């Protein structure tokens, strides 16, 4: 149907067996994001 | 100094008190990797690429680098004032 | 030579052995670029630089 | 910290007659600073820090 995958596509062993992958755009890795907690912590005011 | 990025990072995160620091906290300017040069058209290229790719999915060089490319410092009293910011207090009186 | 330089249309260093058909393989700290990629066939990189 | 390093890349089928030119143009854009313009314009737009 098409010839070029112009999209963000990581390269690994399985895919490289059937299609060559030219050269990398840029180098990245895998990380984890978590929602920040209590933007204003210790909300307990005076008179405590 | 201007040299290879990987070599310079190893020196910088190694000295006494990690005083020596790269500009802008480690900014690179031409992301080109390393490699293994082979003869032109040589047939060993196809399967040697797969072997290197396989190790990346098995976490080999991720822990291997820790055996040779680990730094010593972390790129983060003195009860003295000596004007410091108290000039603003005098600047108010100015 | 060290790491290879092009003088008078000749290559020395590790990249000079492979081009002159004496090595067939060179390893170490080599940086990929267009000029070197024309003579030899670099594999997939495994270290950022 | 990161735990699986692998870059992106343009992909295509085997034996395509463009497996040699298009890789060289990508490398030639790295040195000539083109990827600096594209990365700054899109990714690094900068906000609250
Ligand atoms: C590859 O690039 C060279 C550079 O001039 C060109 O002569 C050649 O035709 C190109 N090959 C293909 C298949 O586009």
UniProtKB/Swiss-Prot annotation, chain A:
Glycine binds at residues 8, 10, 15. Belongs to the glutamate-gated ion channel (TC 1.A.10.1) family. NR1/GRIN1 subfamily. Heterotetramer; the NMDAR subunits are modular and harbor tiered domains that function in concert to regulate opening and closing of the cation-selective ion channel pore. Forms heterotetrameric channels composed of two GluN1/zeta subunits (GRIN1), and two identical GluN2/epsilon subunits (GRIN2A, GRIN2B, GRIN2C or GRIN2D) or GluN3 subunits (GRIN3A or GRIN3B) (in vitro). Can also form heterotetrameric channels that contain at least two GluN1 subunits and at least two different GluN2 subunits (or a combination of one GluN2 and one GluN3 subunits) (in vitro). It is found in: Cell membrane; Postsynaptic cell membrane; Postsynaptic density membrane; Synaptic cell membrane. Component of N-methyl-D-aspartate (NMDA) receptors (NMDARs) that function as heterotetrameric, ligand-gated cation channels with high calcium permeability and voltage-dependent block by Mg(2+). NMDARs participate in synaptic plasticity for learning and memory formation by contributing to the long-term potentiation (LTP). Channel activation requires binding of the neurotransmitter L-glutamate to the GluN2 subunit, glycine or D-serine binding to the GluN1 subunit, plus membrane depolarization to eliminate channel inhibition by Mg(2+). This is Glutamate receptor ionotropic, NMDA 1. A hydrophobic region that gives rise to the prediction of a transmembrane span does not cross the membrane, but is part of a discontinuously helical region that dips into the membrane and is probably part of the pore and of the selectivity filter.
UniProtKB/Swiss-Prot annotation, chain B:
L-glutamate binds at residue 4. Changing residue 86 to V: Increased glutamate and glycine agonist potency. Primarily found in the fronto-parieto-temporal cortex and hippocampus pyramidal cells, lower expression in the basal ganglia. It is found in: Cell membrane; Postsynaptic cell membrane; Cell projection, Dendrite; Late endosome. Phosphorylated on tyrosine residues. Component of N-methyl-D-aspartate (NMDA) receptors (NMDARs) that function as heterotetrameric, ligand-gated cation channels with high calcium permeability and voltage-dependent block by Mg(2+). Participates in synaptic plasticity for learning and memory formation by contributing to the long-term depression (LTD) of hippocampus membrane currents. Channel activation requires binding of the neurotransmitter L-glutamate to the GluN2 subunit, glycine or D-serine binding to the GluN1 subunit, plus membrane depolarization to eliminate channel inhibition by Mg(2+). Belongs to the glutamate-gated ion channel (TC 1.A.10.1) family. NR2B/GRIN2B subfamily. Heterotetramer. Forms heterotetrameric channels composed of two GluN1/zeta subunits (GRIN1), and two identical GluN2/epsilon subunits (GRIN2A, GRIN2B, GRIN2C or GRIN2D) or GluN3 subunits (GRIN3A or GRIN3B) (in vitro). Can also form heterotetrameric channels that contain at least two GluN1 subunits and at least two different GluN2 subunits (or a combination of one GluN2 and one GluN3 subunits) (in vitro). In vivo, the subunit composition may depend on the expression levels of the different subunits. Found in a complex with GRIN1 and GRIN3B. Found in a complex with GRIN1, GRIN3A and PPP2CB. This is Glutamate receptor ionotropic, NMDA 2B. It comes from Homo sapiens. The lineage of its organism: Eukaryota, Metazoa, Chordata, Craniata, Vertebrata. The gene is GRIN2B.
From Swiss-Prot, chain C:
Belongs to the glutamate-gated ion channel (TC 1.A.10.1) family. NR2B/GRIN2B subfamily. Heterotetramer. Forms heterotetrameric channels composed of two GluN1/zeta subunits (GRIN1), and two identical GluN2/epsilon subunits (GRIN2A, GRIN2B, GRIN2C or GRIN2D) or GluN3 subunits (GRIN3A or GRIN3B) (in vitro). Can also form heterotetrameric channels that contain at least two GluN1 subunits and at least two different GluN2 subunits (or a combination of one GluN2 and one GluN3 subunits) (in vitro). In vivo, the subunit composition may depend on the expression levels of the different subunits. Found in a complex with GRIN1 and GRIN3B. Found in a complex with GRIN1, GRIN3A and PPP2CB. It is found in: Cell membrane; Postsynaptic cell membrane; Cell projection, Dendrite; Late endosome. The lineage of its organism: Eukaryota, Metazoa, Chordata, Craniata, Vertebrata. Component of N-methyl-D-aspartate (NMDA) receptors (NMDARs) that function as heterotetrameric, ligand-gated cation channels with high calcium permeability and voltage-dependent block by Mg(2+). Participates in synaptic plasticity for learning and memory formation by contributing to the long-term depression (LTD) of hippocampus membrane currents. Channel activation requires binding of the neurotransmitter L-glutamate to the GluN2 subunit, glycine or D-serine binding to the GluN1 subunit, plus membrane depolarization to eliminate channel inhibition by Mg(2+). L-glutamate binds at residues 31, 36. Primarily found in the fronto-parieto-temporal cortex and hippocampus pyramidal cells, lower expression in the basal ganglia. Glycans are attached at residue 8. This is Glutamate receptor ionotropic, NMDA 2B. It comes from Homo sapiens (Human). Phosphorylated on tyrosine residues.
């Amino acid at each position: 149907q098409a010839d070029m995958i112009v999209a963000p596509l990581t390269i690994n062993n399985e895919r490289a067996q059937y299609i060559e992958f030219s050269k990398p755009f840029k180098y990245q890795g895998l990380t984890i994001l978590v929602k920040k907690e209590i933007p204003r912590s210790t909300l307990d005011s005076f008179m405590q | 100094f201007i040299y290879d990025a990987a070599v310079l990072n190893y020196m910088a995160g190694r000295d006494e008190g990690c005083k020596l620091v790269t500009i802008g906290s480690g900014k690179v300017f031409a992301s080109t990797g390393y490699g293994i040069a082979i003869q032109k058209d040589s047939g060993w290229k196809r399967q040697v690429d797969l072997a290197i790719l396989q190790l990346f999915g098995d976490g080999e060089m991720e822990e291997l680098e820790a055996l040779w490319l680990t730094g010593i410092c972390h790129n983060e009293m003195s009860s003295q004032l000596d004007i410091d910011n108290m000039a603003g207090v005098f600047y108010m009186l100015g | 030579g060290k790491h290879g330089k092009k003088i008078n249309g000749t290559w020395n260093g590790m990249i000079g052995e492979v081009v002159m058909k004496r090595a067939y393989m060179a390893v170490g700290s080599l940086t990929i670029n267009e000029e070197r990629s024309e003579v030899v066939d670099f594999s997939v990189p495994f270290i950022e630089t | 910290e990161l735990f699986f390093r692998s870059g992106f890349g343009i992909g295509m089928r085997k034996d395509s007659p463009w497996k040699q030119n298009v890789s060289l143009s990508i490398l030639k854009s790295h040195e000539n600073g083109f990827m600096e313009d594209l990365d700054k314009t899109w990714v690094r737009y900068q906000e609250c820090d």
